[PDB]
């Protein structure tokens, strides 16, 4: 298992514009297009992202390309972030995947706001961090995906995904 296969299981793949769990316009592998209510603002963003007139539909390759850019941006955002970097550096390879996952879903700002859990992860207090992570809107809103990520942090293995 790796970060790509991990996120592909969590986000799924859709080749037509859809609305995410929060109601925002998304396409492909969890690629947020816009937070605006307008399907037209979404189609515009889409065409801009792909470099062609898409009429709201993309092919697999295009979806995968967006996905590659997004994972790359996620990692690089972690590395440039003063709060996140030290956490990432301290972690093993599996747990690094778990933080990348959170960043991909909720953005660098959002994750960086989990101050207490971050400190617990850094100290390698696994069970405590899992309990703290669960007291969040995140876990309450997407509990199945959250539990999987949390288990990855608790255990350090890919069990939740197998």
Task: Please report, as ranges, the residues that interact with Cl ion according to CB under 5 A.
Answer: 49, 142, 144-145
Element (H, E) at 33: strand 31-34
- Considering the complex, state which of residue 47 and residue 122 has its C-beta at the smaller distance from Cl ion: 47
Q: Residue 106 Cβ, how far from Cl ion at the closest point, in Å?
A: 13
Active site residue 10: no
Q: Residue 10 Cβ, how far from Cl ion at the closest point, in Å?
A: 8
Q: According to the annotation, is 136 in a ligand binding site? A: no
d(CA 106, CA 54): 26
User: How far is the CA of 20 from the CAs of 29, 31, 107, in angstroms?
Assistant: 11, 10, 15
Instruction: Please tell me which residue in 20, 45, 70, 108 is annotated as part of the active site.
Output: 20
Task: Write the CB contacts of 9 (distance below 8 Å, at least 6 apart in sequence).
Answer: 161
Active site residue 20: yes
- Known binding residues for substrate: 32, 104, 117, 132
| Catalytic sites, residue numbers | 11, 20
- Known binding residues: 32, 104, 117, 132
């Amino acid at each position: 298992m790796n970060i790509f296969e991990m996120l592909r299981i969590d986000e799924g793949l859709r080749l037509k514009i859809y609305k995410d769990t929060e109601g925002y316009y998304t396409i492909g592998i969890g690629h947020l297009l816009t937070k605006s209510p307008s399907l037209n603002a979404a189609k515009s963003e889409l065409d801009k992202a792909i470099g062609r007139n898409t009429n709201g539909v993309i092919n697999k390759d295009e979806a995968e390309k967006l996905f590659n850019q997004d994972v790359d941006a996620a990692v690089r955002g972690i590395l440039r972030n003063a709060k996140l970097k030290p956490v990432y550096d301290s972690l093993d390879a599996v747990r690094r995947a778990a933080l990348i996952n959170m960043v991909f879903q909720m953005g660098e700002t959002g994750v960086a706001g989990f101050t207490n859990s971050l400190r617990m992860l850094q100290q390698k207090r696994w069970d405590e961090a899992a309990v703290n992570l669960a007291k969040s809107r995140w876990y309450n809103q997407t509990p199945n995906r959250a539990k999987r990520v949390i288990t990855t942090f608790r255990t350090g293995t890919w069990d939740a995904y197998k």
